[PDB]
């Protein structure tokens, strides 16, 4: 029996049943098997969560045509030593990894096709953010906890991403009022989910006004830890005819009673108001507004690739075929 | 119920860990890290600027924090 006559497509069909390490093993059989093990059709989805690897390797794997790359909490703490051509990657999670600014720039400078990206928790730079603006098809972008970039770089990025649906731009700790003002004045009008929590004094009521004026389609709006927002801003939320999910946790100057107003928003479904309801009164708020779910979501899902059901290895609903489990 | 460790530093960061009781611990995400809004929502109380920067997988009830010096 000769298996050398068996067509390429059928070997690819057999290879596609192999787990990642098994696939790499069989590349060391012959020049033909080696060619086909790196095909394309086999490398569409890749999960290297928590992996310690040289960035030259990740560049090489991406050059094989990866479409979805799940690689959060990884370690790529070595400098790039190779050059790469444009990647096809459309979905990528690098959040909370150990990776230098230059390495991150090397990878992202070759990306123009991203639809979904998370860089949550990573130090960035102006060149990084500027190079991100190549990805004008971005639908979901997570830059939560990111830093190292100016409001000028932010503006370019936001102006480019004119079809953005979800933006998590929260807890960018080095933000000034310039960044916040650029954010509200430059986010795409198309945005339906915005997390702009964590700016405290640097986010003013007028910023909310700008936002609501510019972005009428907001469904999720998270403005947790925004001390400047009180009940005098509440009429702004009534301008949002699609608002379903509002968060105003630790907006300390809100009198608990006034939250009753938000019960008048016809489309509202849930409300997060952690830290501002006096102990022993929460059930009063809940029973006063029984059409709402109140303080039941501690966590944001906005531009988050992977959430809930305690295992979940999917990246924006995509299960990765190649994995180290 | 929630234990807050003492802080130590290197040339760059200050570090603390937080030990959660079983009831709060069961809410801790497995698939991402918590922003300050998120860990405050959970009931964790500390100063500003602490970042939940890694998951200690062997002990999910222990939260690792750091902040720039």
């Amino acid at each position: 029996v000769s298996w050398d006559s068996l067509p390429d497509e059928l070997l690819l069909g057999i290879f596609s049943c192999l787990c990642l390490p098994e696939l790499l093993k069989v590349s060391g059989v012959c020049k033909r098997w080696y060619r086909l093990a790196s095909d394309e059709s086999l490398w569409q989805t890749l999960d290297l969560t928590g992996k310690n690897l040289h960035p030259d390797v990740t560049g090489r794997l991406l050059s094989q045509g990866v479409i979805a790359f799940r690689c959060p909490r990884s370690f790529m703490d070595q400098p790039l030593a190779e050059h790469f051509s444009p990647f096809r990657v459309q979905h990528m999670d690098l959040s909370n990894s150990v990776i230098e600014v230059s390495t991150l720039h090397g990878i992202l400078s070759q990306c123009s096709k991203l639809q979904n990206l998370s860089l949550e928790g990573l130090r960035l730079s102006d060149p990084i953010v500027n190079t991100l603006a190549k990805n004008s098809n971005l639908v979901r972008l997570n830059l939560s906890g990111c830093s190292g970039f100016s409001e000028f770089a932010l503006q370019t990025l936001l102006s480019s991403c004119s079809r953005l649906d979800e933006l998590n731009l929260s807890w960018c700790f080095d933000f000034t009022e310039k960044h916040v003002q650029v954010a509200v004045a430059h986010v795409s009008e198309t945005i339906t989910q915005l997390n702009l929590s964590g700016y405290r004094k640097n986010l003013q009521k007028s910023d909310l006004s700008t936002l609501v004026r510019r972005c009428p389609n907001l469904v999720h709006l998270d403005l947790s830890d925004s001390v400047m927002l009180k009940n005098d801003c509440f009429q702004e939320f009534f301008q949002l005819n699609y608002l379903q999910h509002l968060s105003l946790s630790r907006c300390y100057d809100i009198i608990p009673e006034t939250l009753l107003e938000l019960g008048e928003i016809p489309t509202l479904k849930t409300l997060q108001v952690f830290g501002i309801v006096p102990d022993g009164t929460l059930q009063l708020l809940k029973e006063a507004l029984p059409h709402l779910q109140i303080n039941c979501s501690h966590f944001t899902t906005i531009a988050r690739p992977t959430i809930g059901n305690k295992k979940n290895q999917e990246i924006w609903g995509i299960k990765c075929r190649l994995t180290l489990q | 119920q929630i234990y807050y460790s003492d802080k130590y530093d290197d040339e760059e960061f200050e570090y603390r860990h937080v030990m959660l009781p079983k009831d709060i611990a069961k809410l801790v995400p497995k698939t991402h890290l918590m922003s300050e809004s998120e860990w405050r929502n959970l009931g964790v109380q500390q100063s500003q600027g602490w970042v939940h920067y890694m998951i200690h997988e062997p002990e999910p009830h222990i939260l690792l924090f750091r902040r720039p010096l």
Binding site: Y252, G275 | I2, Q45, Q46, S47
Partner: peptide
């Protein structure tokens, strides 16, 4: 700006 954000005392 009510409620102080700090670590509880030992």
């Amino acid at each position: 700006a009510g409620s102080v954000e700090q670590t509880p005392k030992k």
